[PDB]
């Protein structure tokens, strides 16, 4: 039943391994782009994602 309420019964989503220090295409929970992933020293707040 596709009623107006927000959808809550979704299928599983697959994940791959994490590679760093290379140009890759990434998809972090809905954020899509291209770049080089390297370790950082910033400290986010426990609820912040980007």
């Amino acid at each position: 039943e596709l009623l107006h309420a927000p959808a809550t019964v979704c299928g599983p989503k697959k994940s791959t391994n994490l590679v760093k220090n290379k140009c890759v295409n990434f998809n972090f929970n809905g954020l899509t782009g291209t770049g080089v992933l390297t370790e950082s020293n910033k400290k986010f707040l426990p609820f912040q994602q980007f």
Partner: protein, 49 residues
């Protein structure tokens, strides 16, 4: 000044237009004991914006 953290979210989907706050009754032995007239308010105060 103090900011509020996002806490939790719920995908309820219902419509809300009114609300009401619940309270606790500080019943004791000094009160008569009946529900109507045997309640003590305690200490409390809340604000609504």
């Amino acid at each position: 000044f103090s900011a509020l953290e996002p806490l939790v979210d719920l995908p309820i989907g219902i419509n809300i237009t009114r609300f009401q706050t619940l309270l606790a009754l500080h019943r004791s032995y000094l009160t008569p004991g009946d529900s109507s007239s045997g309640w003590t308010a305690g200490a409390a105060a809340y604000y609504v914006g």
